[PDB]
Ligand binder design. Structure first.
Ligand SMILES: Nc1ncnc2ccccc12
Length: 167
């Protein structure tokens, strides 16, 4: 048994809810929250900007030190950093950004990072301002992630379309 409430059961391991991820993280304090990161860990907008603002910019300060030491992530890659006031850990995962021309086949590689964690609170990778089709992102998630994932979708209209269209 875990602390997540009102998530709609999709599969054996994937759950979905129309919710503000900042607000969900603040309430649950999950072991892992996933950030929709870019390779530079520059959290200006989307899930990344929303999460970083909720940490009072401590996520960005930590991220800048990580990049200064290690250099940029790979598209499809990840790193584990602090969850600050939101979670124990933040898994920063880089899905491909269609609005930068990145290979959408890297979306499966991105979701494979989730399998290193038994339970996660996450957004749909490559959805929203990343330019991918969120229906596609949900299909890759279900077909890739084997660990228990609680998906928070910010937009109500998109949530309803994702549930209604789910195969
Ligand atoms: N949860 C969010 N709060 C504010 N802005 C956002 C932008 C994209 C996704 C989620 C959020």
């Amino acid at each position: 048994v875990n602390s997540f409430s009102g998530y709609l059961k999709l599969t054996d391991n994937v759950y979905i809810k129309n919710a503000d991820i900042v607000e969900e993280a603040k309430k649950v304090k999950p072991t892992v929250v996933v950030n929709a990161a870019n390779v530079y860990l520059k959290h200006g907008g989307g899930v990344a900007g929303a999460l970083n603002k909720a940490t009072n910019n401590a996520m960005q300060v930590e991220s800048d030190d990580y990049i200064a030491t290690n250099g940029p992530l790979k598209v499809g890659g990840s790193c584990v950093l602090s969850g600050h006031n939101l979670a124990k850990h933040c898994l920063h995962v880089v899905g491909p950004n269609v609005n930068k021309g990145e290979d959408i086949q890297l979306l499966k590689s991105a979701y494979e990072n989730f399998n290193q964690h038994e339970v996660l609170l996450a957004p749909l990778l490559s959805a929203g301002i990343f330019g991918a089709d969120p229906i596609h992102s949900l299909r890759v998630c279900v077909d890739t992630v084997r660990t228990n994932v609680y998906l928070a979708v910010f937009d109500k209209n998109l949530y309803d379309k994702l549930v209604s269209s789910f195969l």
